């Protein structure tokens, strides 16, 4: 039917960069 | 030579009873471009620490 160096701990920690990613207008 | 620029840093502030801060000098630049990484204690005029 159906088919299928390490030092400067405090100062160099204060100098860690803050890098904010840019934006593109829409 | 003379006029070389030395760069250092400090951190941690002072405790009570301390009147000297530990400075570490990191690099020095000769007026002709030489650069050597001396990581040395900074002292006073007569070699007293900090």
């Amino acid at each position: 039917l159906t088919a299928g160096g390490g030092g400067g701990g405090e100062l160099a920690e204060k100098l860690q960069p803050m890098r904010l990613s840019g934006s593109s207008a829409g | 030579d003379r006029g070389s620029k030395v760069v250092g840093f400090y951190q941690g502030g002072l405790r009570q009873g301390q009147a000297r801060i530990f400075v570490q000098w990191s690099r020095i630049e000769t007026p002709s471009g030489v650069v050597i990484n001396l990581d040395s204690p900074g002292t006073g005029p007569l070699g007293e620490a900090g």
């Binding site: 904010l20 990613s21 840019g22 934006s23 593109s24 207008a25 829409g26 | -």
Partner: protein
């Protein structure tokens, strides 16, 4: 003490800030804003 009991419970109430309307303010841009996709330039012919 009842006075200390009242103070301990109601002492820590943070303040409230009231800024009016029409005030002048700034925005300090924190990132590079790119307007290349939405504008373009052309020269206006003389006369």
């Amino acid at each position: 003490s009842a006075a200390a009991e009242a103070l301990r419970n109601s002492i820590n109430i943070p303040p409230t800030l009231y800024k009016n309307q029409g005030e002048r303010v700034n925005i300090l841009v924190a990132r590079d804003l790119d307007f290349s996709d939405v504008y373009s330039l052309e020269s206006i012919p003389t006369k």
